[PDB]
Amino acid sequence: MKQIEDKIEEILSKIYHIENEIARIKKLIQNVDVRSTENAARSRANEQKIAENKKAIENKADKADVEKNRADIAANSRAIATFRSSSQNIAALTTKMKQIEDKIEEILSKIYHIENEIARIKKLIKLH
Amino acid sequence: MKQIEDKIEEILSKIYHIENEIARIKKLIQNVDVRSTENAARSRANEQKIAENKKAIENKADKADVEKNRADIAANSRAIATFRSSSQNIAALTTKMKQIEDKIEEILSKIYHIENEIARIKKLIKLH
Amino acid sequence: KQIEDKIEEILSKIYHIENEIARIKKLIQNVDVRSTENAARSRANEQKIAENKKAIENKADKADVEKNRADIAANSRAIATFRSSSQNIAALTTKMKQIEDKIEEILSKIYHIENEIARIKKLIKLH
Ligand SMILES: [Cl-]
Ligand SMILES: [Cl-]
Ligand SMILES: [Cl-]
Ligand SMILES: [Cl-]
Ligand SMILES: [Cl-]
């Protein structure tokens, strides 16, 4: 009788409450199902950006290569101070050379004066 | 007894529906769980791979150092063609030199013949 | 009889269902959170990737360093040649020295000659 109509009253109340929870549950699963797929795309985007970075790195030059170069550069820099000295030796060998040419033209002229004297002397002596 | 029966029927239909909805929820839920654990695995791997790239990046050369080297190299190259006309000046000095060497020996040769002819003049004088 | 027995069943199915729902709620909640973590982790990763992309925009390519390496080995090959030349300076310096010497040899021979001649000029005027 009414014990039944109370169990039924309880049974309906539970059922209605169960229905609200399911609706609310379904909603939540939709919220999370959508996020997890936006995450799956966000992470497949990233792993492909990273394979680009991995690649774009296989292209950038080592640091050891560029520290060899800065050594070999400073090596050649120093060799330029070893063979910058023998530039001012040229400007010194040209002025001395020139001096030597001047003295040589002066020596020649003395010889030609001398030769003229000796021509004179050989004549004076045969004229006796 | 035929209102208690109508409500009971309403419940049996409602229960069957709720059961069917719960089966939908479970497998749906399962899949979001399955997918979210992938996304987690994917995002931590990517984390590892991002790290790897951060290190590799650290072993590559900063452009500014490579740009230094370029400039230094060019300024070395500047002061190297600069010392090509140094040796241009040499080839003139070497020839100008051998022109002086050939003179000096001729000068000597005229001088030796002068000496001889003086020795002659002197001997000619004493005998008179 | 036959009402009481359906109601009995119904109450057992409700209880069964209440457990399924309370189990479902913590599954969902767990998965919700795991996805909120996944979401931030993947947003962070994209920020880190985006620091690596910006650190790649401050490094030199292989081509440019390869170039520098060639430019250098040239300047080594170009110098080394020129280095062999400039030993020809040392040759002019000592040869100039020998000359300087031969000239002072010559200059002094001449002065002794001038002297002899000065005497001869006089001796011939003395006849
Ligand atoms: Cl997720
Ligand atoms: Cl370099
Ligand atoms: Cl260099
Ligand atoms: Cl990610
Ligand atoms: Cl990266």
Residue numbers in the entry:
A (entry chain C), B (entry chain B): 104 to 231
C (entry chain A): 105 to 231
Task: Quote the original article.
As part of that study, we identified a putative TAA in Actinobacillus actinomycetemcomitans, OMP100, which carries insertions of 2 and of 3 residues within the heptad repeats of its stalk. The insertion of 2 residues extends a heptad to the 9-residue motif IENKADKAD and occurs between three N-terminal and two C-terminal heptads carrying N@d layers; the insertion of 3 residues is directly downstream. For structural characterization, we therefore expressed residues 133Q-198K, covering the two insertions and the five N@d layers, fused N- and C-terminally to the trimeric form of the GCN4 leucine zipper, GCN4-pII. The construct yielded a typical α-helical CD spectrum and, upon heating, unfolded cooperatively with a transition midpoint at 91°C. We obtained crystals in space group C2 that diffracted to a resolution of 2.3 Å, with one symmetric trimer in the asymmetric unit. The structure showed a continuous heptad coiled coil with two discontinuities. However, the insertion of 2 residues led to a sharp break in the coiled coil: In the middle of the IENKADKAD motif, the three chains of the trimer cross each other to form a triangular plane perpendicular to the coiled-coil axis. Thereby only the central three residues of the motif, KAD, deviate from α-helical structure. All three fall into the β region of the Ramachandran plot, but only the central residue, alanine, forms backbone hydrogen bonds with the alanine residues of the other chains. We call this structural element a β-layer. Here it directly connects two α-helical segments, where the C-terminal one is rotated counterclockwise by ~120° around the trimer axis, as viewed from the N-terminus.
α-Helical coiled coils are ubiquitous protein domains, found in a wide range of structural and functional contexts. The structure of coiled coils is understood at a level unrivaled by any other fold. They consist of at least two α-helices, wound into superhelical bundles and held together by a mostly hydrophobic core. The seven positions in a heptad are labeled a – g, where positions a and d are oriented towards the core of the bundle and are thus mostly hydrophobic. We find that they indeed break the α-helices to form short β-strands, which associate into a triangular supersecondary structure we name the β-layer. β-Layers are found, also repetitively, in natural coiled coils, where they form regular fibers with alternating α- and β-structure, a protein fold that has not been described so far.
